[PDB]
Design a protein around this ligand. Sequence first.
Ligand SMILES: C[C@@H]1CC[C@@]2(OC1)O[C@H]1C[C@H]3[C@@H]4CC=C5C[C@@H](OCCC(CO[C@H]6O[C@H](CO)[C@@H](O[C@H]7O[C@H](CO)[C@@H](O)[C@H](O)[C@H]7O)[C@H](O)[C@H]6O)CO[C@H]6O[C@H](CO)[C@@H](O[C@H]7O[C@H](CO)[C@@H](O)[C@H](O)[C@H]7O)[C@H](O)[C@H]6O)CC[C@]5(C)[C@H]4CC[C@]3(C)[C@H]1[C@@H]2C
Ligand SMILES: CCCCCCCCCCCCCCCCCCCCCCCCCCC(=O)N[C@@H](CO)[C@H](O)[C@H](O)CCCCCCCCCCCCCC
Ligand SMILES: *Cc1c(COP(=O)(O)O)cnc(C)c1O
Lengths: 59, 471, 555, 177
Amino acid sequence: HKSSMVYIPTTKEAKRRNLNTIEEVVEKLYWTYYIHLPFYLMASFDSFFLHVFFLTIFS
Amino acid sequence: QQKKSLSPQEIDALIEDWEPEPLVDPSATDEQSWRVAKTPVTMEMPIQNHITITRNNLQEKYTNVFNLASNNFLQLSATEPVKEVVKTTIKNYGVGACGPAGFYGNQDVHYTLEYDLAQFFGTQGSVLYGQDFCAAPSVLPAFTKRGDVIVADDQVSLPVQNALQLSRSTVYYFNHNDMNSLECLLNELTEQEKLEKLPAIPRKFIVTEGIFHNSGDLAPLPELTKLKNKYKFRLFVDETFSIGVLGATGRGLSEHFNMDRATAIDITVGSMATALGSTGGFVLGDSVMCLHQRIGSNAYCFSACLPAYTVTSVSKVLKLMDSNNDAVQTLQKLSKSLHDSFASDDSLRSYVIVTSSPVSAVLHLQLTPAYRSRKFGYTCEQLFETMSALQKKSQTNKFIEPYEEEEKFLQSIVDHALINYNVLITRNTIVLKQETLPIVPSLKICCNAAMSPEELKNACESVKQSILACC
Amino acid sequence: YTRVPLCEPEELPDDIQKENEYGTLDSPGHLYQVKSRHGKPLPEPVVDTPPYYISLLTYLNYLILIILGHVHDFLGMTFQKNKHLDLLEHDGLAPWFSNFESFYVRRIKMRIDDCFSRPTTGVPGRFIRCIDRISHNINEYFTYSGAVYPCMNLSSYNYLGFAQSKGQCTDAALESVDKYSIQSGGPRAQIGTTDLHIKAEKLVARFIGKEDALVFSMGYGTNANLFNAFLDKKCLVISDELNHTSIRTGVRLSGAAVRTFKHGDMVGLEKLIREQIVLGQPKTNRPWKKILICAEGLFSMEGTLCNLPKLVELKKKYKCYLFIDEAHSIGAMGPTGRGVCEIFGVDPKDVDILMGTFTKSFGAAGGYIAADQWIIDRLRLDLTTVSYSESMPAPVLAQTISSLQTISGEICPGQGTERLQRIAFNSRYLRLALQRLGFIVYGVADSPVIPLLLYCPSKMPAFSRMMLQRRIAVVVVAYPATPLIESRVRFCMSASLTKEDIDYLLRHVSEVGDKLNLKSNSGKSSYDGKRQRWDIEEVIRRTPEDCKDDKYFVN
Amino acid sequence: PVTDHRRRRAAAVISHVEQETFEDENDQQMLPNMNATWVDQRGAWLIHIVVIVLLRLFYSLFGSTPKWTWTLTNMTYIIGFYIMFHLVKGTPFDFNGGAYDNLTMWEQINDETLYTPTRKFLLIVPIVLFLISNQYYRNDMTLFLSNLAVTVLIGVVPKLGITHRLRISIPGITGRA
Ligand SMILES: C[C@@H]1CC[C@@]2(OC1)O[C@H]1C[C@H]3[C@@H]4CC=C5C[C@@H](OCCC(CO[C@H]6O[C@H](CO)[C@@H](O[C@H]7O[C@H](CO)[C@@H](O)[C@H](O)[C@H]7O)[C@H](O)[C@H]6O)CO[C@H]6O[C@H](CO)[C@@H](O[C@H]7O[C@H](CO)[C@@H](O)[C@H](O)[C@H]7O)[C@H](O)[C@H]6O)CC[C@]5(C)[C@H]4CC[C@]3(C)[C@H]1[C@@H]2C
Ligand SMILES: CCCCCCCCCCCCCCCCCCCCCCCCCCC(=O)N[C@@H](CO)[C@H](O)[C@H](O)CCCCCCCCCCCCCC
Ligand SMILES: *Cc1c(COP(=O)(O)O)cnc(C)c1O
């Protein structure tokens, strides 16, 4: 039984098998939970999230 | 002068006292059941010129019956080249589409036919529909809401009537093919609209038909185009019976008058089953119109895609019609001869009349009002007013005796010719309850491009003698 | 490049094509038989909810989208007008459509429009071929290239695998074409009717279990042009809030009064029936001429069944009428395939009118209505489609007759039962595995539609694109079709798929969901009242044996 | 006319929306509105508190006096709620034929029911916000008067038993029936 179908190898399983995960996870959490994909040209809204710099300074 | 003004125990008494009505009234079923017993049924052979039929539950059978009750005109779908395309598609695509329009439903043959229609009919785009009966009431409501104005003819068909009821807008009627009535009506509407000083201009439309389904007349397009531009209106034309039979090649009503469709007409509704030979329908227009129909039309959004073999066959027919135009010429010669054979007879002047144009491929016959009043003793104006009152009052039973007598008489004319001379001619099939505008019974004789002039001539003489003998 | 290419068919040996359209079973242990509920009523369904911050984030995202959309519209249409010439008056003529009535399509859906209207080619079997396209501007126009790649099918209405180009049905259709042409003369009243129409009607009436039935060309027209035949402005219609648009259009054309009751709430229905019987018509308080109840068999967006015995006893007690739609239930539900009536054991005589469609299971196009003798005899004279529309073509009739005969068992023995067992096992296994992984899955235990909830709006395009990159086809729906909080992905199972394909899909879906953090289960899905975060290997090893047992499903 | 479906624009100082006819009311309002159903749902009541807290924190990040911060947050919340609910008239998607073209979202809540718990909550929030906020600028009478005027004239008068289906032709000829 043979069919004309191509199987895509899975990442982390026979793709990478043959220090950076934390940054990727943090980036995904920041991006997907906020409204960015249905926006066009509005990547400048990330500049509005400069509150991290404002709260960085203490006393 | 203020004037001085229930228990749960008696609530169940009201419930028990309720007496509902039957779902369907069976009182008049027996008297009106002769229509089913007289419907011809073809036996194991395609509907063509010569057929073998059985009627009334296989009780009677006829062999080699000349057919004059088929809506197919060009007869190009029974040829060998089309059958080759149909069989190949089934082996490679199947029979079903299995999906809506927006969910993996287009199989890159639906796109091709859309391009072909625009190039053949000289427009910018087209949209396909599953059924022709559900095309007009699905496009008109999408472009009209409350507060709009629609001007319509007084002889439109039932599917057009359904669209105007669901459109939810003001509807006006003008006389059948009367530009004096149309021009007068438009002038008053414009003036009062200017007087009220509305913040925005509402949408306005004109509704008519190319060749009428119940009469067989035409529309004067050159007059309508001048008025719509003068008074800032829009034109809506239905061309179910006028595409493929009018014009040098068969483009439609615009080619007959030597005009351009891109400017004369705005919305065109057509059917692929009358002449092309495949199921479905289409709507023609510009680009902005089409994009709104992809999401604003209920029939398009909420239905499965049309099968594949129907689309492929029509494209082959359109290609064949472009190269050669011999099928249309044969059809027009027979149609003109048929009309003159029934209009130049002095023995049928006092009995029946003809209400069809020479360019029409279907001949309509109606009884003269003098003869109808002599025997049945009723008038069309009286018939219209009786049914209007019943519909408004919402009566369960809607039965009229003089109307039934005329239907039986016309059936006798049909039956007499078939038994004695083996010629099948049909009778107009309508439902009087659903109608809103006046209508009367009639007869129909059809024609196509596969006939011979000698055979048609003998059939015409037989029907003429059949009418005289019955009367 | 801009126009859609016409793909030349490929040349392949027969066996490869058969495997592409229909799979071959590996072991006889992947089949399940469906039992019948004699006296067990349907319990009230239970739903699960995510934590609060998901809802709060969704609300904030929608608020931002609305604010920026309205601001952009106002600023763009005030500071410039040359580009927006389709939304302003020109030479004294109003525009085609309005600005406010089409805000969502232009301002939210247009940025993710690449996930809708995907062109395909070939038979829609186990593997569906798709044409590639390149997005330009922001989903404005596309450029196509001559390349076609296969994808796993989870987005097509093919339950029993009847969409094949090699079999008895295709040969029957070709023979029908040889005998009867594709031409149809006209309306069924004039010339359209033939003997095959009578054969199909009688066979359908015998199969369903009623006395007689009719056939139509379009499913939409069956509902749109039916209610005006026996309803008027002095009748009441009680319908669920979740019904198809065809029923609503038909009732609107009829003109009867409409009152709706909440989904899955019989007490409210009884209260409404009592109040409407007592009060009567408005402004006059005369009694209603008749009362009709409308309902649907299986609801596709949720995969839940209607409670039939309750409706039957209510209509018998209060002297009402019942109307049942079986678009998604015929030929795929029950021990044999009769519908929900066979599932519940209710005799078909109780239901006044039955309806169905041949597109979802039998691989054709059409519809039917089944009722008693006198009702059909009157409706034949009183209907509009019969004497004003076209007639059904012959190949579709041949396909439908062959499919119904095959499922009944007259021809091709030992095929229909095997297909039904395959689809039942596949649905149960997929639902149980998805619930064990940690997701949220709606519906009854055996339902071909599996809705998976994806709450945040930004997670639909990402999931769809990642699944497409891994050669799996999915369908996503969102507001306003679904509630604002709940947006879902719908899975349509087939009898042509195999356990290996399910394992492949499960692995890829699990890893993608772990990447996107879509696992939110509150423990009410598990029958033991505990959270379930398992491994993929353990689920694959244990679920197929435990899939058959019915004690692992809450509903 | 055979249908007589027109929209009237009668001009008067005080006018009301006429009651809907049988066809428009008993038949064209049957399906869920999908514009006011989301109010009585999950998480539809804490979001106002979250918005208030976020606005207050955003203003405090600037580093201004408490009086200006609280006055600005009150005005912004009330103006935003007014713009969202009371100003616009209609619905962003076609319903049946344009049945809800004369009413705002506030009138459409709970099928034109006058007193429901959500309406009580929506009326209660501005008052409690005003009582909490006034404690910082009691000394300045002008700011107190301005806050009281904003609250009473925008966040109190529209949400009343009176002024239901009430239109004034001063800023434009309104449409009724
Ligand atoms: C310096 C400071 C900074 C801070 C700040 O202040 C300044 O910054 C400022 C920034 C400001 C915003 C800027 C802009 C908007 C959008 C606006 O609008 C919403 C959308 C529409 C809302 O719904 C209406 O519209 C329905 C439409 O159906 C109407 O429906 C009926 O009437 C139908 C009539 O047919 C009949 O069918 C039926 O009877 C029935 O359906 C009904 O009246 C009503 O519901 C209204 O607007 C649209 O509709 C207009 C008309 O079509 C468009 O066209 C018009 O604008 C074109 C522009 O080029 C010009 O050509 C022409 O004037 C003309 O064509 C316009 O573009 C377009 O926006 C609502 C206000 C808001 C948010 C402002 C708030 C205040 C600020 C936040 C200020 C903030 C505080
Ligand atoms: C950094 C600057 C400051 C940032 C702050 C910005 C302003 C926030 C202030 C708070 C505003 C009040 C908060 C109450 C709302 C709570 C959360 C609700 C979540 C969203 C709900 C979505 C509901 C969808 C229903 C769809 C519907 O039916 N829609 C319409 C027709 O019916 C409504 O007409 C429509 O929705 C409102 C249209 C209003 C258009 C806004 C125009 C304003 C342009 C921007 C100008 C600034 C405005 C703010 C001062
Ligand atoms: C799926 C479905 C339809 C679709 O019918 P078409 O044949 O695609 O027009 C119609 N009605 C109901 C109730 C459905 O579930």
